Scaffold this active site. Structure first.
Site, PDB file in Angstrom:
ATOM      1  N   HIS A 270       7.089  -2.799   5.847  1.00 56.42           N
ATOM      2  CA  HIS A 270       8.442  -2.431   6.281  1.00 56.42           C
ATOM      3  C   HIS A 270       8.766  -2.764   7.722  1.00 56.42           C
ATOM      4  O   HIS A 270       9.901  -2.584   8.113  1.00 56.42           O
ATOM      5  CB  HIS A 270       8.703  -0.941   6.022  1.00 56.42           C
TER       6      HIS A 270
ATOM      7  N   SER B 275       2.513   4.237   8.193  1.00 54.28           N
ATOM      8  CA  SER B 275       3.172   4.613   6.963  1.00 54.28           C
ATOM      9  C   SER B 275       2.797   3.696   5.796  1.00 54.28           C
ATOM     10  O   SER B 275       2.810   4.137   4.636  1.00 54.28           O
ATOM     11  CB  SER B 275       4.682   4.604   7.088  1.00 54.28           C
TER      12      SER B 275
ATOM     13  N   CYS C 108       1.924  -0.590  10.032  1.00 50.33           N
ATOM     14  CA  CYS C 108       2.296   0.740  10.464  1.00 50.33           C
ATOM     15  C   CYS C 108       1.489   1.758   9.656  1.00 50.33           C
ATOM     16  O   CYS C 108       1.150   1.532   8.492  1.00 50.33           O
ATOM     17  CB  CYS C 108       3.808   0.954  10.214  1.00 50.33           C
TER      18      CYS C 108
ATOM     19  N   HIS D  73      -0.218   5.144   4.534  1.00 53.66           N
ATOM     20  CA  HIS D  73       0.067   6.338   3.768  1.00 53.66           C
ATOM     21  C   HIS D  73       0.328   6.023   2.313  1.00 53.66           C
ATOM     22  O   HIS D  73       0.057   6.863   1.437  1.00 53.66           O
ATOM     23  CB  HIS D  73       1.277   7.076   4.328  1.00 53.66           C
TER      24      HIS D  73
ATOM     25  N   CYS E   3      10.104  -1.116  13.075  1.00 55.20           N
ATOM     26  CA  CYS E   3       9.677   0.249  12.847  1.00 55.20           C
ATOM     27  C   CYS E   3       9.154   0.907  14.086  1.00 55.20           C
ATOM     28  O   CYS E   3       9.796   1.774  14.658  1.00 55.20           O
ATOM     29  CB  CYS E   3       8.675   0.397  11.653  1.00 55.20           C
TER      30      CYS E   3
END
Ligand SMILES: NC(=O)c1ccc[n+]([C@@H]2O[C@H](COP(=O)([O-])OP(=O)([O-])OC[C@H]3O[C@@H](n4cnc5c(N)[nH+]cnc54)[C@H](O)[C@@H]3O)[C@@H](O)[C@H]2O)c1
Ligand SMILES: NC(=O)c1ccc[n+]([C@@H]2O[C@H](COP(=O)([O-])OP(=O)([O-])OC[C@H]3O[C@@H](n4cnc5c(N)[nH+]cnc54)[C@H](O)[C@@H]3O)[C@@H](O)[C@H]2O)c1
Ligand SMILES: OCc1c(F)c(F)c(F)c(F)c1F
Ligand SMILES: OCc1c(F)c(F)c(F)c(F)c1F
Ligand SMILES: [Zn+2]
Ligand SMILES: [Zn+2]
Ligand SMILES: [Zn+2]
Ligand SMILES: [Zn+2]
EC number: 1.1.1.1
Lengths: 374, 374
Positions: B67, B48, B46, B51, B174
């Protein structure tokens, strides 16, 4: 008799920003097609009118301001079907054309015919019905109620109960309906909830009234003027707090008081900082914050969007979310049926000629609503 | 055969920002009370997770990220009642403790036990189950799925259908659930509406899926990478626009295209400017804009609150607004019944050992989701 004729009457003209209103003779043209000329009976002093004076709101000057009012129809133009001479009416500063995409939407009320977004200061046809000392004078929000007579478009007027006390129901033209609707319609305050109301003027008190009507268990009033607290409690606040009394920021105080954030918060002042504070004090996962206040022209706020990513809802509204022409007559009917009170908002009643004194009372912190009587 | 014992296994350790993951041996402690140790089967990449690498998202380092995943329970700690060894599970990066005020609220999902708002990078008890080179390694969002084995708190795992295909349903952990829920649960997209979706990665495609499922008539995809447009149309976009093609700002373009603004907009990128653009492009009186993208750490946006005062609603959400533990098994069940598709999101498959290649594919623009298999 006046139908079809120019009326010469008294009005409060604002020639430039940051000056007193000038009470003098104006000429009011007769209504054209789909227009309505109204003899004013009472008009309230709303902080938004003061924003025109202070330059917080930009609208073309010179102007006849005033938007919270009630009066009696003097005459109608060709094609008017919704009011007749002699009817009690409330001018609608947010029109309801009934035809635009907003009017047709179940939750929209900010009719595209409004003169708020990009103010022209005219009738719908782009012209003015007012002259003063040979000069054209702008309208304000299609209403211009600080005058013994005004002319409004049909989409900007509602007929109300003939038995209505106009010196009270004028408040349904702005401040009561705005605050009450902000709570009951825009926020949709729930039974048992905790609410925070920032600003305890006429609009904020009306927000409190709506929160109590919706069954909130706790209603926390917030104002830097503690003199506002007693009346806030009278209309439903369970507690009041003054940010100036605390070492910590009030969002932290309110988060602590509410054991992790409020369910509903309302900004009813018009400051960028309190808009952000109000958002922050609602619970981060499910809180809702409603902006009611009008902030200074062309200024942006700064905020961290993590406040929203966690789950908060931020919204604003004009006129409590009410479709204006549908809603105003019903609100008046509800008032007449004792469903809510207006007297708590009214602190002063003055003749129209004392408009400047009425504004001074507002600016000094001493009044909630002054009603001016013609 | 490993219950109660330390497991040595491979994980992807991020020692430093802006560096490749290091695939190397870690020690995974056995689960303590109310903890669950999971043998990972599949995990998605993902944005994120990226990030964390880029410093967009700040969490303590060194860390085992990941995650979006699915696996099989290896062992359970004392007192665990909701999963058993051998169960298929999805780790929940948003926990559901079931006890806090958010978990008890009908519309809240951002459980107060989360490790997202103020990340500590630990288990609920403030400690770590991971050692590498003799050094403690942080967890990420209580999940840490970039490891052959992880340990999660019981409130951070959901049991799913034993017949589930884990290499697909990891996306329910997610990206799919986030995008789909953002449309169907958070925005509550209506039949016949016009939607604008900013960002056409895995999450924005999932938003499109949800808007289509909700019956939107028009779904306008917005991305600066036109390579993303073909798949966006496959899953329901009716049109796609690239802001770089236009002289005017895209909010003006989208307002024109929607004859006065869209019903629902979604920011699914993570930029401050597109959050404001997405708000602006929704209709001023009744539009709703949802922030899904994750902003750069500690940065504030600037906006004019008149955008809200007219009637817009602005909100954000984590994980599509879904209460995680309640919702993930139901979403898996629905997937098994073919109520939605996940294959359109999966563009690449790699072994876990090729994690860095998977990130390269994301960063180049080439992939939507790469699924890593352990
Ligand atoms: N959205 C709408 O349709 C709508 C309608 C009516 C009024 N308004 C706006 O709503 C606002 C309130 O109007 P009103 O009730 O007539 O005004 P008001 O009577 O001036 O009340 C404002 C209150 O805010 C208080 N206040 C000032 N600064 C602070 C601060 N820092 N913290 C806490 N309290 C503070 C002040 O003491 C006063 O009691 C104004 O900005 C109006 O322009 C909007
Ligand atoms: N709220 C949550 O629970 C949640 C869950 C999952 C992901 N996220 C975030 O959602 C965002 C999207 O994640 P993803 O789909 O995995 O990422 P992604 O695959 O990188 O997709 C982002 C898309 O945005 C496009 N893009 C980049 N800049 C612009 C621009 N200026 N204008 C228009 N398009 C542009 C880009 O080309 C790409 O296709 C990231 O910020 C994630 O961190 C949030
Ligand atoms: O008080 C109502 C009111 C507003 F809510 C405005 F946003 C505005 F611009 C204005 F002139 C006004 F009178
Ligand atoms: O992609 C899901 C996701 C988020 F939505 C976040 F807000 C966040 F901080 C994070 F680490 C994360 F993984
Ligand atoms: Zn209209
Ligand atoms: Zn007003
Ligand atoms: Zn919880
Ligand atoms: Zn994610």
């Amino acid at each position: 008799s006046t139908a079809g004729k120019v009326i010469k009457c008294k009005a409060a003209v604002l020639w430039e920003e940051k000056k007193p209103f000038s009470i003098e003779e104006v000429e009011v043209a007769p209504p054209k097609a789909h227009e309505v000329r109204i003899k004013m009976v009472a008009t309230g002093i709303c902080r938004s009118d003061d924003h025109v004076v202070s330059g917080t709101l930009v609208t073309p000057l010179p102007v006849i301001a005033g938007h919270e009012a009630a009066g009696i129809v003097e005459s109608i133009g060709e094609g008017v079907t919704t009011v007749r001479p002699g009817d009690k009416v409330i001018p609608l500063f947010t029109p309801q054309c009934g035809k635009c995409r907003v009017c047709k939407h179940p939750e929209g009320n900010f009719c595209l015919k409004n003169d708020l977004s990009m103010p022209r200061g005219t009738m719908q046809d782009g012209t003015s019905r007012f002259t003063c000392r040979g000069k054209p004078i702008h309208h304000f929000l299609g209403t211009s109620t600080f005058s013994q007579y005004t002319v409004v478009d049909e989409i900007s007027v509602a007929k109300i109960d003939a038995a209505s006390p106009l010196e009270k129901v004028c408040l349904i033209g702005c401040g009561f309906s705005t605050g009450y609707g902000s709570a009951v319609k825009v926020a949709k305050v729930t039974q048992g909830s905790t609410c925070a109301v920032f600003g305890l003027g006429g609009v904020g008190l009306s927000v409190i009234m709506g929160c109590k009507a919706a069954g909130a268990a706790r209603i926390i009033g917030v104002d830097i003027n503690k003199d506002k607290f007693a009346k806030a409690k009278e209309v439903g606040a369970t507690e009041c707090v003054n940010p100036q009394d605390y070492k910590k920021p009030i969002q932290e105080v309110l988060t602590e008081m509410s054991n992790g954030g409020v369910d509903f918060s309302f900004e009813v002042i018009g400051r960028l900082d309190t808009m952000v504070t109000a958002l922050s004090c609602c619970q981060e996962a499910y809180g809702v914050s409603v902006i009611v206040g009008v902030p200074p022209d062309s200024q942006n706020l700064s905020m961290n969007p993590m406040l929203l990513l966690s789950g908060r809802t931020w919204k604003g509204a004009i006129f409590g979310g009410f479709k204006s022409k549908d809603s105003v007559p019903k609100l008046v009917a509800d008032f007449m049926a004792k469903k809510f009170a207006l007297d708590p908002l009214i602190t002063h009643v003055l003749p129209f000629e004392k408009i400047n004194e009425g504004f001074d009372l507002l600016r000094s912190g001493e009044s909630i609503r002054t009603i001016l009587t013609f």
